């Protein structure tokens, strides 16, 4: 439970691939 919570962000970054799409993803998460 805890491990997935702390590991969610960089595994999402790994799934995103390109760093520009991850930059826009972090922009989305900031705008929220």
């Amino acid at each position: 439970s805890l491990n997935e919570e702390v590991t969610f962000f960089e595994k999402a970054k790994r799934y995103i691939g390109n760093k520009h799409l991850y930059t826009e993803f972090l922009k989305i998460l900031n705008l929220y």
């Binding site: 805890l2 919570e5 702390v6 930059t23 972090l26 922009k27 900031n30 705008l31």
Partner: protein
């Protein structure tokens, strides 16, 4: 009603100021931000910060349900 937000237009380098917050958490930016690169201790700092907080939450859960069942007897 509603609220609208529009991102700021791009400004040439002679009139555009990029500033770095001193406050890391909860800095109300207008939604207009820039991502800087992230430079091992920070990784474990995040791990304990979730532990503690979730623990406190459990405690917040456990402090209010006891008042609920102690209200039904009255």
């Amino acid at each position: 009603n509603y609220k609208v937000w529009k991102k700021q237009r791009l400004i040439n380098k002679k009139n555009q100021l990029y500033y770095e917050p001193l406050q890391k958490i909860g800095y109300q930016n207008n939604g207009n931000i820039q991502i800087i690169p992230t430079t091992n201790s920070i990784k474990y700092d995040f791990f304990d910060k979730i532990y503690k907080s979730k623990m406190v939450q459990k405690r917040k859960l456990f402090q209010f349900q006891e008042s609920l069942i102690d209200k039904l007897v009255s």
